[PDB]
């Protein structure tokens, strides 16, 4: 008999139902987000970090470190091969 008032009732529930769950999921991660490679930490030195940076990095990612390890184990084992036989 009178005029009910829909057009300003969105205060109680934000428009949409499915994207409401994703709103909180995607709005919160943008605060603590790296602008462009912040704190890359590409430089380190712990007597083995240089080897990791030079060979164990994703830029090369080749089979050369495995061959170097094989050569090193051969060099180490030559001495005890002489010692045993």
């Amino acid at each position: 008999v009178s005029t009910l008032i829909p057009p300003k009732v969105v205060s109680s529930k934000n428009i949409g139902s499915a994207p409401n769950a994703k709103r909180i999921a995607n709005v919160v991660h943008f605060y603590k987000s790296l602008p462009q490679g912040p704190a890359p930490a590409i430089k380190a030195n712990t007597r083995l970090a240089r080897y990791k940076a030079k060979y164990f990095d994703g830029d090369n990612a080749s089979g050369k470190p495995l061959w170097h390890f094989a050569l090193g184990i051969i060099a180490f084992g030559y001495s005890m091969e002489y010692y045993f036989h």
């Binding site: 008999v1 009178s2 005029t3 009910l4 829909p6 057009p7």
Partner: protein, 57 residues
């Protein structure tokens, strides 16, 4: 004087493609329309509400 009021009312109606599913807003719209139609009909059909005692008597 009434033109502005219903102009803005139907402007809100043109905005109202998104609040679809309302129950009595459109009903109130036809209520206003019926009441103002009865207004203009009664005002147009209303002859001078007095007996012309000079001649009609």
């Amino acid at each position: 004087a009434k033109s502005a009021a219903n102009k803005l009312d139907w402007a809100k109606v043109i905005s109202s493609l998104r609040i679809t599913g309302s129950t009595a807003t459109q009903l109130s719209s036809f209520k206003k329309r019926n009441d103002e139609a009865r207004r203009q009909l009664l005002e147009l059909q209303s002859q001078p509400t007095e007996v012309d005692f000079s001649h009609y008597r």
